[PDB]
RNA sequence: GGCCAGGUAGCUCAGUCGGUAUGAGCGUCCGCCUGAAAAGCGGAAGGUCGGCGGUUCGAUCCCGCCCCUGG
């Protein structure tokens, strides 16, 4: 997308419609900048000083040069006895510090792009500086695909014509390229219609002299644009595709076989480029074919068959205008970003194909010494058409007013719309707007908008914010993900930012079944690394290489977390075809794509390795324990303002004797725990490693009110000891106890658990302090004996135990 | 140490492929005990 | 894709055209030492030298393709 020209031709285009127009390279590149064009690099040219002069070699010595610089040197690839050289001696400077009987200088050395100018550029002795013009300054322009008007000379000068205010004169015009005679056809054409041709021209030039160099000031610029020159006819319409924006080809005349055909690519042809190399070809692809072999790839490359060479005498330039969508495909599978493909997928003005022919035939035989034939075959259609321009808009007279929320003097928008080009009528207060031909992208009231305010200027559009929206706030979600994150950071633990990529077979490391539902991933076709092309399941191996990297740098006792989404496929990546986008889908339609697309739930996870309390004063602190995943789990819970139940499971990568599967309610959200030591080490985890993972889509959305009674009346304490069998969980004990214990039970906590032959073998101790009060009434120690026997029943009926004795 | 005398009694790679082949088996034989002993190992009390 | 310098211990990096990477600094472990530490001194652990193949009794080093960073 990248447009690079020199300061002197454009400022030259400008400078024919308001002479002496010239500005500060930096103000060239601010105005550029407010219009709309990215300026990418601004580069000047040279510079050199001292005794840089030219000179003409005299004798060759196989290497010895003799260079008559009012003087006489020797100085020790590429040149003859009698070419003009550039020449360094030992003096002043030379970009890029060197100091230099002498050097010939090379056009990287100069900081211009051996080299060797053309007979007749300059006479021997003169300043170099002003031969090559140093004082020139390159611009790199990066050009939008919405301004494909813009990759030429015109085109730019045309927009700083508009945003300086300035007469234009379009180098394309029939003063600048005066019409050539027009007795006949040049050459036998046919075309398919159907290929997406717009126009093709054709015109010959006779008797070129195969001897004859392109002028400087014609290679210089070429040079400047980034396009290698090597003769007159092809540097011409390299010349003219820079200056005019419409990209021209020459063919040998004398190496075409019979009339010239356009058309589609019959099955799985080929064709040999100017490079030299067979390029297979598409049932879709437009080519120009003769008798013989293909000619060139339709507006994408030039074939070597009609190539011109050094030996060739008869020229036949063809102007064209492709499809661009034809010519984008074809040029991004052959890898060719051609200067002429990038400017027809960009769309080319069609209305100026015979006047840049015509400027092609004129300057190649202005400096190559040939005869434009009177001839030309101009294909324009069926019907021939006449008119290129766009349909055209109907738009409010103050649209743009409105919508750049300025009032803008009368007439603003009419001038612009016509600055650019177009023909604007008035009825009423609805304008009647005709693009020119070379602005395809202007087809709604928008696109004529965006042309007024940025030529006015984004910076007269004042700052106005909007009124505030009576709106809502966070999202019950939104508050609670926030609320876990405050609350695990407050705990502890410290949050990254997980990356969806899963490492290489990570799965393979935990040992998942090959039908675990984690192992069902959506796949990338071009990942960054072709190891990790899988995408995550579980937040967790995100976090466990985020913890590998803290401990293999020194901080060995971490705590990690990360509240982000997952992906998980439910079937095989099914496609949805193409909805019409000039209307809106039906709801159908919608749950269509949604039931197309992953799940994607809402993730909480963390891991856990080396000390959980770090060392002190206090004492040595304490090493990362289940309990502490399953602590993260309960944090999470209060945030999420939800009452969570845990079960021993077993679940990979966890340790089966050291999970926990997370219930809220009778739906399971996840699992927390140790993780497995064979998972660890096959991972190189640090040993112990602890991790959780909920599902906060499962942890439904809860807003509680309550409404607490304080009691004034004296509480009784009591504790009861019961025993369970080892497999019995404590919270089984608390619930039997508390349902049991009817509403008197104020609380309850456990304080002791207690093993040993005292007790049954695996069987356990449990003690529970109670905190039994009335709402009305002082209790007596039987009223809270009662209760407590009522809860000691109801842990022997659900947990079998038994009232320790 | 010629191509002699480089070569057969030089050929240890079988007895040191003998002995690494039993090394591979035990690490796969006590890996699997490991991991055995793992799920019939007295649990914890997650609540 | 082209062309290229790289990928070597936990971190950062040297070094080798066939049998030792005598790997370095720091990180990890043990001893002397301290109430317990650290330094210091002394003694150890740990690398499939980027993957997959090719040649040899034997390849980090030689051949081919490929994964990712400077290009
Ligand atoms: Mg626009
Ligand atoms: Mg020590």
Redesign the pocket.
């Known amino acids: 997308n990248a447009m690079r020209l020199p300061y002197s031709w454009l400022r030259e285009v400008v400078a024919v419609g308001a002479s002496g127009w010239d500005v500060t390279p930096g103000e060239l590149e601010q105005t550029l900048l407010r219009i709309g064009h990215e300026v990418e690099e601004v580069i000047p040219l040279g510079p050199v000083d001292g005794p840089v002069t030219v000179g003409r070699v005299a004798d060759i010595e196989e290497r010895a040069c003799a260079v008559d610089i009012r003087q006489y040197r020797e100085i020790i690839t590429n040149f003859a006895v009698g070419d003009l050289v550039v020449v360094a001696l030992p003096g002043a400077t030379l970009p890029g510090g060197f100091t230099i009987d002498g050097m010939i200088c090379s056009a990287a050395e100069l900081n211009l792009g051996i080299l060797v100018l053309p007979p007749g550029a300059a006479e021997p002795g003169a300043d170099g500086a002003g031969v090559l013009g140093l004082d020139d300054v390159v611009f790199h322009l990066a050009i939008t695909p919405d301004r494909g008007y813009c990759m030429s000379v015109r085109g730019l000068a045309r927009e700083l014509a508009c945003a300086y205010d300035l007469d234009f004169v379009d180098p394309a015009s029939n003063s600048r390229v005066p019409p050539l005679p027009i007795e006949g056809p040049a050459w036998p054409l046919t075309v398919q219609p159907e290929t997406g041709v717009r126009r093709f021209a054709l015109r010959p030039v006779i008797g070129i002299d195969p001897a004859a160099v392109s002028p400087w000031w014609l290679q210089r610029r070429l040079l400047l644009c980034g396009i290698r020159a090597t003769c007159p006819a092809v540097d011409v319409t390299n010349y003219v595709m820079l200056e005019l924006g419409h990209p021209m080809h020459a063919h040998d005349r004398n190496r075409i076989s019979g009339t010239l055909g356009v058309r589609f690519a019959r099955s799985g042809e080929t064709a040999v480029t100017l490079d030299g190399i067979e390029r297979k070809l598409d049932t879709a692809d437009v080519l120009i074919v003769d008798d013989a072999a293909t000619a060139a790839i339709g507006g994408v490359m030039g074939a070597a068959s009609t190539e011109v060479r050094a030996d060739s005498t008869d020229v036949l330039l063809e102007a064209a205008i492709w499809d661009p969508a034809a010519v984008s495909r074809t040029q991004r599978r052959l890898h060719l970003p051609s200067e002429a493909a990038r400017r027809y997928e960009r769309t080319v003005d069609p209305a100026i194909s015979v006047a840049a022919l015509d400027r092609c035939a004129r300057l190649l035989a202005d400096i190559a010494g040939g005869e434009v034939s009177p001839t030309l075959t101009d294909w324009r259609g069926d019907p021939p058409c006449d008119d290129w321009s766009p349909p055209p808009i109907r738009m409010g007279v103050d649209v743009p007013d409105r919508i750049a929320g300025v009032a803008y003097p009368q007439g603003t928008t009419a001038r612009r719309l016509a600055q650019i080009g177009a023909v604007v009528t008035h009825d009423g207060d609805t304008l009647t707007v005709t693009p020119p031909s070379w602005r395809p992208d202007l087809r709604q009231p928008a696109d004529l908008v965006e042309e007024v305010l940025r030529l006015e200027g984004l910076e007269v559009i004042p700052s106005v914010l909007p009124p505030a929206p009576a709106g809502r706030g966070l999202t019950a979600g939104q508050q609670r993900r926030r609320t876990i994150g405050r609350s695990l950071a407050l705990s502890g633990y410290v949050e990254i930012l997980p990356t969806p990529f899963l490492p290489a077979g990570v799965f393979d490391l935990w040992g998942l079944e090959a039908d675990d539902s984690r192992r069902m991933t959506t796949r990338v076709l071009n ?5 990790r092309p899988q995408l995550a399941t579980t937040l967790l191996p995100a976090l466990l290489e985020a913890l590998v990297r803290n ?4 901080l060995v006792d971490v705590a990690l977390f990360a509240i982000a989404q997952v992906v998980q496929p439910t079937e095989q990546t099914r496609g949805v075809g193409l909805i019409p986008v000039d209307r809106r889908p039906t709801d159908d339609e919608i749950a269509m794509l949604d039931a197309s697309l992953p799940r994607q739930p809402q993730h909480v996870a963390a891991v856990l390795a080396g000390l959980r309390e770090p060392r002190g004063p206090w004492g040595p602190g304490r090493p990362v324990e289940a309990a502490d995943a399953f602590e993260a789990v309960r944090i999470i819970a209060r945030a999420s303002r939800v009452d969570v139940t845990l079960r021993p499971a077993q679940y990979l990568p966890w340790h089966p004797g050291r999970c926990a599967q997370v219930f809220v309610g009778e739906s399971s959200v996840g699992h927390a725990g140790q993780l497995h030591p064979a998972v660890i080490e096959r991972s ?1 985890l640090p040993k112990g490693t602890c991790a959780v993972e909920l599902n906060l889509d499962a942890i439904p959305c809860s807003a509680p009110l309550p409404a607490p009674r304080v009691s004034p009346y004296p509480a009784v304490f009591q504790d009861v000891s019961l025993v369970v069998a080892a497999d019995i969980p404590a919270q089984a004990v608390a619930d039997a106890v508390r349902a049991g214990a009817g509403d008197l039970l104020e609380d309850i906590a456990l304080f002791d658990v207690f093993t040993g032959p005292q007790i049954g073998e695996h069987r356990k101790s449990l003690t529970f302090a109670l905190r039994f009060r009335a709402p009305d009434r002082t209790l007596t120690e039987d009223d809270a004996s009662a209760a407590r026997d009522a809860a000691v029943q109801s842990a022997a009926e659900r947990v079998g135990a038994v009232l320790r004795g | ?1 010629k ?1 002699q005398r ?3 009694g ?5 007895a040191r492929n003998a002995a690494q082949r039993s090394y591979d088996e035990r690490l796969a034989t006590l890996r699997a005990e490991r991991d055995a002993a793992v799920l019939v190992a007295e649990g914890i009390d997650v609540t």
């Open positions: 990942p960054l690394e072709a190891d401990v293999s740098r020194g190189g | 140490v191509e480089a070569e057969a030089k050929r240890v790679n079988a």
